[PDB]
Structure formats: C-alpha cells, structure tokens
Ligand binder design. Structure first.
Ligand code: K5O
Length: 467
C-alpha cells in the first residue's frame, strides 16, 4: 500500500469506510484489493461472527495491510510476468488464463459454492473460498495488482468474465457458471453472443471500468445474518456507498445497482434523496441508454416494488415489459435462472396477487385491476412475450403446468372486462407478436373460458385423450 492509502486507518465506523471509498475513488485507479479486503473484513465481523461486537469492527491498518500482503505475495509469486511479454500496454490471453488458474488452484477442493459471504478477497485469503462471480472479481483484482490496467470485469445478469487486450476487445471466461456443467475456461464469449442467449445479453453486457468494479463489490455486500435477519450496519454501509457512487456518476451504466439502491431506500429512506420509484426508472433508463434495452432485471426490480405495494396495474405493466425484452432472445441451455423468474411470476406471484384482488373485489373495491381492461392487456402482453421467446429457441419454455395457471388467471377477469381489449393485427389496444397468442385471441374474450382449448393452444398439444 502507498502512504496516502493508509492515513484514514483505523476505520472505526461506517462513515470511516465511506471516507476510504471516497478517497480511493478520487485516486487515479481505486485499489480493488484494498477495498474488497476492507468490505470482507467488516462483513465477516457484522454478519458471519458478531461475537464481541459493540458498535463496529475496527479495521486496524496492521490487520488490513497483512491481508493485503498475503494477497499480493500469492499473486506476484505465482504469476511471472516476464514469461508473458506485454506488447502495447495490453495483456495476452495466456496471461489472463494464468491469473485465472492461480485463483482457481488456490481454492479449497470441496465447499458449498452457494454459501453467503464468500464473495470477497477476505473470503479468498482467510477461507480459500469464492463464489462464481467472486472468482472473476478476484482475477480482475489480481490483474490490477500486477499492473495490468487493461483487464476489466464483464457482467451479464447471471454471469461474469473478463475483457482485456487491444481496445479492450477480447473476452475470456475465467470462472464457472451454474453447476459447472460446461466450462469454456479461457475461451471467448462469442458463441454465447451469437446464439442470442440471455446469459450473454446479445453482447449488451456490462464492460466495467475500475469505478464500476467498485460498484460491483458494493452490490456484492451480503447483509444477511441468517434467513430471517439482516445486519442493519451492513444495509446502511451498502446504502451509503451506493449513494457515494451515484453522486460521483459511477452508477450511470449499472442498471441493477440503481435497483439495489431503490430497494434500500424503500426499506429506510434517506432525507433529501429521490424516491424508490425514481430510482427504479433511472435503472430502466440506464438499460435503454447503454444496453439497447436488452436487460430483464431493471423491470423485475420495478415490478417487485409494485407487487410488494399491491399496485397490481403497475406490477402487471412492469412484468409485461420484462416479457417484451425476453421475446427477442433464444431460450438456451444455461438461461435457467431467468426461466425460473418468469415461472415464479406466472405460476405463483401473479396467481397470489389476482386471488387477493378477487377477494377485495368481492368486498367492494373500486379501481380494481380485475375491472381494468388495461390490466388484462398487460397480462396478455406478458404471456405473448414468453410465447415469442420460445419461438425458434433450441429448448421449449411452455408446458401444461403453465396452462393451468393461465386459465385460472384469465378467469379472474369477467368477460365484460376481457371483451374491452382490442387485439389488432400487424399489419386498450394490444398487438401480439407470438403465433401462440394470435391463435388464442378469440378464446381470450369469450364469456366462458374454454380451458381445454386454451391448454391445447398454449402447449401446442396435438391430441386429446383417446377413450
Ligand atoms: C445489484 N447489482 C447486481 N445484481 C445482480 N443480480 C441481482 C438480480 C436481482 N436479484 C434480486 C431479485 C430476484 C428476483 C426478483 C427480483 C424482482 C422480482 C420481481 N418481480 N423478482 C422475481 C421474484 C419471483 N420475486 C417476485 C416477488 N417479489 S416480492 C415478494 O418482493 O414481491 C420477490 C421477488 C429481484 C430484485 C438480486 C441479485 C447481478 C448479477 C451479476 C452477474 C454475476 F455473475 F456477477 F453474478 S452482476 C450483478 N449486479
């Protein structure tokens, strides 16, 4: 560490950690290794082991500098730069692979790879454990420590890798995804881009600078103590650090970070700040501006907020927007995480919401989503996008389990409401993009819902029971 990096120690409070991040973010290049070690230290003593806690776990320079020295020694010792000449101030694929191998080979042979609190360089050093995206971050921090200014973190909505090389144009896989089913470690991401999978976002993934890599580690803070309890101290630290990054402009290209900040503000609003809704909409605006509106989670963040607040109209609208994004992807083998999200929304969340709305309608609610044809249109647009998604995909999406819930959900709206939606062809008003929903149009607006016909149309089940 440089002398100027050490003057704020010891860190005795949340605000002292914020000052450290402010100082680093004002430097030429913030020190990723220093910052991740500090966050992991304070997370360990606020969420993993709170024995002896009286206010805040004091981070002494001697402790942090020793951890820092362990990391930099491990990397500099195992990676000999002389073997990998750098032509052009840029790194080679072999060098990036070597750094990835060094991180990988340091990890415990067996552990639960989905645990909490294994995201930081603190976990790497003290526990020899990292989660999937934690390995990618560690590769980037190791590269920074080695002076490899061109190596940066790349992020989709469910995976992480690195960019590097001439113009920062090369990609390399450096960690596992999911079960570790495939690998492609060391290869480009271009096959996944070319297949139009959600996992690689059609190439509209995040290419971090150093400041966005700091935002990533802040988003990566895990306040959870257990399944029922969060650390207030860590929630506050994450919130204050996210506001710092926001004010400095470093969340401009980070949609999900804005959703995280909005969620924190909902829990505990900061005087004189934008409201959660404004922040969710900035997240969506970031995705439209920088990522061709090809991201799903900005709309999911918004929908969840509306769901929690029982704004059924606005929740349905946001979900219909999630589907309007997914429809221009192919559903591929490693996209299971976003299938799980759509599944739970269609087959659990929406049914719960509409069941409650039905009871409230019985009790005399006015302005009910169930009496609003625009709400029925949103529901139909949601299913349309899912059906369009499935078109031309190498693996199907829909099955009869989905059909039971679609029929139930349609039935929550009376015929007099459903009949008000106008479904218009290309070449409330809605246009369907999917052939499935186009074929379902007359069934949707009929006084009595034909369940079996709907099932057949949604699943493209050819035949009905013989006997
Ligand atoms: C913040 N930075 C960041 N975050 C990353 N990933 C985040 C993606 C969002 N999740 C939280 C999450 C999960 C599911 C969500 C939602 C929202 C919805 C909806 N509807 N849904 C659907 C589900 C079914 N329900 C709906 C009902 N609600 S409720 C009870 O509240 O009403 C709960 C959630 C959210 C917000 C947290 C993690 C990532 C990932 C990266 C790639 C890599 F590899 F690094 F991991 S970078 C990154 N950055």
């Amino acid at each position: 560490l440089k002398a100027a990096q050490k003057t704020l120690f010891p860190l005795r409070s949340i605000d002292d950690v914020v000052r450290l991040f402010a100082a680093e973010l004002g430097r030429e290049e913030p020190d990723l290794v220093l910052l991740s070690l500090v966050l992991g230290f304070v997370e360990h003593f606020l969420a993993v082991n709170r024995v002896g806690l009286t206010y805040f776990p004091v981070a002494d320079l001697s402790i942090i500098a020793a951890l820092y020295a362990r990391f930099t020694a491990q990397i500099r010792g195992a990676v000999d730069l002389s073997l990998y000449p750098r032509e052009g101030g840029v790194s080679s694929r072999e060098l990036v692979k070597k750094v990835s191998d060094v991180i990988w080979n340091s990890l415990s042979r067996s552990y639960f790879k989905d645990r909490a609190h294994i995201q930081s360089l603190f976990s790497f050093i003290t526990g020899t454990k990292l989660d999937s995206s934690g390995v990618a971050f560690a590769v980037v921090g190791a590269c920074q420590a080695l002076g490899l200014r061109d190596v940066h973190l790349a992020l989709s909505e469910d995976h992480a890798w690195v960019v590097f090389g001439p113009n920062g144009e090369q990609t390399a896989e450096v960690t596992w995804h999911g079960k570790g089913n495939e690998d492609r470690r060391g290869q480009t991401v271009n096959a996944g881009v070319a297949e139009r999978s959600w996992l690689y976002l059609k190439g509209s993934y995040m290419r971090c600078d150093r400041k966005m890599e700091v935002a990533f580690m802040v988003c990566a803070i895990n306040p959870s103590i257990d399944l029922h309890t969060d650390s207030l101290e860590l929630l506050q630290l994450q919130q204050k650090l996210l506001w710092l990054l926001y004010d400095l402009g470093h969340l401009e290209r980070y949609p999900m970070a804005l959703g995280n900040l909005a969620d924190l503000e909902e829990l505990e609003p900061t005087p004189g700040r934008p409201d959660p809704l404004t922040l969710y909409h900035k997240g969506i605006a970031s995705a439209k501006t920088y990522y061709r509106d090809e991201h799903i989670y900005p709309y999911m963040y918004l929908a969840g907020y509306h769901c929690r607040n029982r704004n059924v109209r606005e929740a349905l609208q946001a979900w219909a927007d999630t589907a309007t994004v997914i429809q221009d992807y192919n559903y591929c083998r490693e996209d299971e995480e976003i299938y799980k999200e759509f599944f739970e929304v269609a087959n659990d969340v929406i049914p719960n919401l509409l069941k409650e709305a039905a009871s409230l309608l019985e009790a005399g609610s006015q302005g009910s989503a169930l009496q609003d044809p625009e709400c029925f249109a949103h529901l139909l647009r949601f299913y349309d996008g899912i059906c369009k998604w499935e078109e031309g995909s190498p693996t199907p999406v829909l099955h009869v389990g989905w059909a039971t819930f679609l029929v139930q959900s349609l039935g929550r709206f009376e015929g007099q409401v459903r009949q008000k939606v106008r479904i218009v062809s290309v070449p409330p008003v809605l246009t369907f993009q999917s052939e499935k929903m186009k074929g379902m149009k007359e069934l949707l607006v009929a006084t009595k819902i034909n369940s079996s016909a709907i099932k057949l149309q949604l699943t493209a089940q050819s035949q009905v029971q013989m006997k």
